[PDB]
Write an enzyme that holds these catalytic residues in place. Sequence first.
Site, PDB file in Angstrom:
ATOM      1  N   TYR A  60       0.856  -1.203   0.000  1.00  0.00           N
ATOM      2  CA  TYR A  60       0.000   0.000   0.000  1.00  0.00           C
ATOM      3  C   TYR A  60       0.888   1.249   0.000  1.00  0.00           C
ATOM      4  O   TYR A  60       0.601   2.242  -0.711  1.00  0.00           O
ATOM      5  CB  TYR A  60      -1.001   0.105   1.159  1.00  0.00           C
ATOM      6  CG  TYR A  60      -1.718   1.450   1.157  1.00  0.00           C
ATOM      7  CD1 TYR A  60      -2.658   1.745   0.190  1.00  0.00           C
ATOM      8  CD2 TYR A  60      -1.291   2.480   1.980  1.00  0.00           C
ATOM      9  CE1 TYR A  60      -3.244   2.994   0.142  1.00  0.00           C
ATOM     10  CE2 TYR A  60      -1.850   3.749   1.931  1.00  0.00           C
ATOM     11  CZ  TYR A  60      -2.812   3.988   1.002  1.00  0.00           C
ATOM     12  OH  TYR A  60      -3.400   5.225   0.883  1.00  0.00           O
ATOM     13  N   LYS A 150      16.774   9.022  19.511  1.00  0.00           N
ATOM     14  CA  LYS A 150      16.661   7.849  20.394  1.00  0.00           C
ATOM     15  C   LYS A 150      17.918   7.002  20.352  1.00  0.00           C
ATOM     16  O   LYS A 150      18.101   6.103  21.202  1.00  0.00           O
ATOM     17  CB  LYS A 150      15.452   7.004  20.014  1.00  0.00           C
ATOM     18  CG  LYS A 150      14.149   7.812  20.120  1.00  0.00           C
ATOM     19  CD  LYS A 150      12.962   6.903  20.403  1.00  0.00           C
ATOM     20  CE  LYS A 150      11.600   7.546  20.150  1.00  0.00           C
ATOM     21  NZ  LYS A 150      11.397   8.933  20.645  1.00  0.00           N
ATOM     22  N   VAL A 194       1.743  10.395  17.832  1.00  0.00           N
ATOM     23  CA  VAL A 194       0.841  10.915  18.826  1.00  0.00           C
ATOM     24  C   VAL A 194      -0.247  11.852  18.258  1.00  0.00           C
ATOM     25  O   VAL A 194      -1.409  11.721  18.670  1.00  0.00           O
ATOM     26  CB  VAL A 194       1.605  11.572  19.978  1.00  0.00           C
ATOM     27  CG1 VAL A 194       2.381  12.816  19.524  1.00  0.00           C
ATOM     28  CG2 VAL A 194       0.623  11.930  21.118  1.00  0.00           C
TER      29      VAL A 194
HETATM   30  O1  LIG Z   1      -1.156   7.757  23.047  1.00  0.00           O
HETATM   31  C1  LIG Z   1      -0.108   8.410  23.210  1.00  0.00           C
HETATM   32  C2  LIG Z   1       0.950   8.198  22.330  1.00  0.00           C
HETATM   33  C3  LIG Z   1       2.136   8.880  22.555  1.00  0.00           C
HETATM   34  N1  LIG Z   1       2.273   9.680  23.646  1.00  0.00           N
HETATM   35  C4  LIG Z   1       3.516  10.421  23.873  1.00  0.00           C
HETATM   36  O2  LIG Z   1       3.712  11.312  22.825  1.00  0.00           O
HETATM   37  C5  LIG Z   1       5.119  11.419  22.503  1.00  0.00           C
HETATM   38  C6  LIG Z   1       5.314  11.019  21.062  1.00  0.00           C
HETATM   39  O3  LIG Z   1       4.967   9.656  20.914  1.00  0.00           O
HETATM   40  P1  LIG Z   1       5.044   9.013  19.424  1.00  0.00           P
HETATM   41  O4  LIG Z   1       4.464   7.650  19.537  1.00  0.00           O
HETATM   42  O5  LIG Z   1       4.477   9.980  18.490  1.00  0.00           O
HETATM   43  O6  LIG Z   1       6.581   9.008  19.052  1.00  0.00           O
HETATM   44  P2  LIG Z   1       7.976   8.465  19.784  1.00  0.00           P
HETATM   45  O7  LIG Z   1       8.542   9.649  20.548  1.00  0.00           O
HETATM   46  O8  LIG Z   1       7.658   7.317  20.642  1.00  0.00           O
HETATM   47  O9  LIG Z   1       8.829   8.179  18.557  1.00  0.00           O
HETATM   48  C7  LIG Z   1       5.840  10.453  23.451  1.00  0.00           C
HETATM   49  O10 LIG Z   1       6.300  11.226  24.556  1.00  0.00           O
HETATM   50  C8  LIG Z   1       4.746   9.530  23.902  1.00  0.00           C
HETATM   51  O11 LIG Z   1       4.895   8.999  25.241  1.00  0.00           O
HETATM   52  C9  LIG Z   1       1.180   9.897  24.490  1.00  0.00           C
HETATM   53  O12 LIG Z   1       1.271  10.664  25.457  1.00  0.00           O
HETATM   54  N2  LIG Z   1       0.036   9.232  24.275  1.00  0.00           N
END
Ligand SMILES: O=c1ccn([C@@H]2O[C@H](COP(=O)(O)OP(=O)(O)O)[C@@H](O)[C@H]2O)c(=O)[nH]1
Lengths: 339, 339
Positions: A60, A150, A194
Amino acid sequence: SIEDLLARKPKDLDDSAVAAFLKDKVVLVSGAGGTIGSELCKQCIKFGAKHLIMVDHSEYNLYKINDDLNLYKEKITPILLSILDKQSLDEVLKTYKPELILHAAAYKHVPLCEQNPHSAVINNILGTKILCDSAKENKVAKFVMISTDKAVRPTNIYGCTKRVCELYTLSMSDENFEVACVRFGNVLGSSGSVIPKFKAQIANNEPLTLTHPDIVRYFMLVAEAVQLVLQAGAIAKGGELFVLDMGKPVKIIDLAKKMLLLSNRNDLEIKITGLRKGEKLYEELLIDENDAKTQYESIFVAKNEKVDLDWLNKEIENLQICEDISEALLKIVPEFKHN
Amino acid sequence: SIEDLLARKPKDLDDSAVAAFLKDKVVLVSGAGGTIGSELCKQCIKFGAKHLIMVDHSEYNLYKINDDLNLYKEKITPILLSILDKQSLDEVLKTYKPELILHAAAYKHVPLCEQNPHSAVINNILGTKILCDSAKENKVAKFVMISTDKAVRPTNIYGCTKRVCELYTLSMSDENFEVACVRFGNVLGSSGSVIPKFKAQIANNEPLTLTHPDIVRYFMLVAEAVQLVLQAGAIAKGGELFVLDMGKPVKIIDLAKKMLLLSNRNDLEIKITGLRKGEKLYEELLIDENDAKTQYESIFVAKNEKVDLDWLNKEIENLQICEDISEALLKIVPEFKHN
Ligand SMILES: O=c1ccn([C@@H]2O[C@H](COP(=O)(O)OP(=O)(O)O)[C@@H](O)[C@H]2O)c(=O)[nH]1
Ligand SMILES: NC(=O)c1ccc[n+]([C@@H]2O[C@H](COP(=O)([O-])OP(=O)(O)OC[C@H]3O[C@@H](n4cnc5c(N)ncnc54)[C@H](O)[C@@H]3O)[C@@H](O)[C@H]2O)c1
Ligand SMILES: NC(=O)c1ccc[n+]([C@@H]2O[C@H](COP(=O)([O-])OP(=O)(O)OC[C@H]3O[C@@H](n4cnc5c(N)ncnc54)[C@H](O)[C@@H]3O)[C@@H](O)[C@H]2O)c1
Ligand SMILES: O=c1ccn([C@@H]2O[C@H](COP(=O)(O)OP(=O)(O)O)[C@@H](O)[C@H]2O)c(=O)[nH]1
Ligand code: NA
Ligand code: NA
Ligand code: NA
Ligand code: NA
Ligand code: NA
Ligand code: NA
């Protein structure tokens, strides 16, 4: 929109430099249909590439970027392929002879990589090795790998795999094959991130799920991050680890509140759900006070030492048969502090 | 809704039969995050499976179905894996010992498979072989493969690969390992299909692109097709090739016209763009006048002969290395009329 509010708006975007770098090149993008890869594809067209080879294992995703670029269909080739298939990947590189590889294929979800550590190692480390080895063998001039904040003092499988990918690609760089790695933080609205989750919660009348009240991330628009990656690639002489200036940290709670305010759904609660295994409250700031400046205020060069490839290849062999992946990774990346 | 207008609304959906088939089973769904696979997962939960193992190589798709099913997280396991990885797939089957596999992983886009015939062969035929072989070796009781109307007298690489998958899986069926294949036509609104393409065209104030004014397809809603697949699985004794009654065909021009009328966007043109390589004007009608009836008016049983597996295994080995894949597939599927 929230994207607008959190954009970096870098002062030092340079279209003509990117055009000079890409004009009339055959460029292969791995992960071409992904969030970052799709934008890399679009910018390769914008900035004058002659032929774009789009490699992606997700049908996709490949379908979609190929369709998005239909007006340029004579200049693009959709290759439905995993970069783990060395023999087919080698045939692709021989047929099209790219001069530049932009490597944006990886598994990136921290929880899924914690749950599937072997597949994270295979897809991220082995995939990167295969693609790099193939690129170097086939005399591709320049290889740019996309990386992440990260990767710095990693606390999770994902971040640690990306650190190994840095070490591997940078250690491959020589007089013929020039490698750049570029680290940046979160891309606003990227796949499975998020902002889309919170949009979907609001639209379904669900409370927003916030991991922790104090959690922060650094953010950039995909078009900003990608153009800066390309600028870094353009200036790279080989062996550089670049880091992007992401601007100010964003508290996720403020993001959530702003999204609720913008959609007039302050009826909804924000529920705290807790930090996940291997998840950082604050990712490491990308630019160190001693990193080298470049001509672009948004791009710095971080220090890196090559490792011996004989050693690293042996450790990568070990990762594929070991009992305890976490322990095996720590041998390669001694700063890994898993969860 | 255009979806609502073209739904089959089968009179013979049977929730209690599906519950009896699935209650307290450990079920593994390959391609779990795809259009069909995701609905399989949802119906596994609805109809009482004990543990759902979700296998998909696309991280976003896996992330998404896992998130969709969050209320059932204690009963689901997201496995980020390609079914081409025999060693890891075998470990999954040995660990979880599923009683039922629902195989919905494939590449399905006809144009992409024409452009990437080797990858179509590998992902579809070899992936099916690896999964089916692992399933039989690990004493999985029942294996159900999703198939297509395009497998009948195929004119494209995709359709031909799916016919080979039918031959292989049905030839593996025995007293202890019951295989069913279920053929059906187009799922309304599926990933990368005509309805989303027309929706996107109308949203971008672009003319709708119609391949030919006379082209027709048979359609079903995903929930209807999937429940019928599960009803078929439930009644299967092994070795059956099932076919679904899709009702009347739908001319795509009428579909386009209806979408315009429903979106109140009759300002837009329908442009004719032409048939594609290997594309049929009319797919083959699924139900032959001599197919056997079942207790469900929507489900028939088609004739199929097993083939010798030693010969078919040799031909599959050849497909992986040969230079003329079209010619090679013809030697396996004599009815293949490529383009
Ligand atoms: O349902 C959610 C998903 C993500 N986060 C937070 O939002 C930020 C971004 O998360 P995402 O999954 O977008 O990206 P990551 O930083 O893990 O690559 C991080 O601090 C997560 O803990 C949150 O509070 N609730
Ligand atoms: N999104 C972010 O916030 C962010 C920030 C910094 C760095 N990165 C890094 O950027 C890259 C892409 O992230 P994204 O947000 O675009 O993710 P994404 O999942 O949307 O895109 C990755 C693409 O790679 C493809 N892919 C994955 N494994 C592959 C394989 N073996 N062969 C071929 N294709 C494969 C996927 O199908 C997908 O289309 C990753 O390397 C990620 O680690 C992401
Ligand atoms: N959509 C239709 O109209 C339709 C109609 C009849 C039959 N089918 C058949 O249904 C099945 C799914 O079609 P769909 O519409 O859901 O497509 P899809 O692409 O949305 O779903 C397929 C899923 O399988 C996964 N996958 C593919 N190769 C894999 C691999 N090697 N390992 C693990 N996961 C893999 C993909 O990531 C994806 O999530 C296919 O077998 C297709 O051939 C589809
Ligand atoms: O832009 C498009 C895409 C598809 N189609 C037609 O719509 C039908 C369904 O196409 P889709 O790609 O959804 O599925 P396929 O039948 O190829 O699996 C086929 O008759 C296509 O020729 C069309 O007219 N215009
Ligand atoms: Na300039
Ligand atoms: Na997009
Ligand atoms: Na093209
Ligand atoms: Na019933
Ligand atoms: Na869905
Ligand atoms: Na779970």
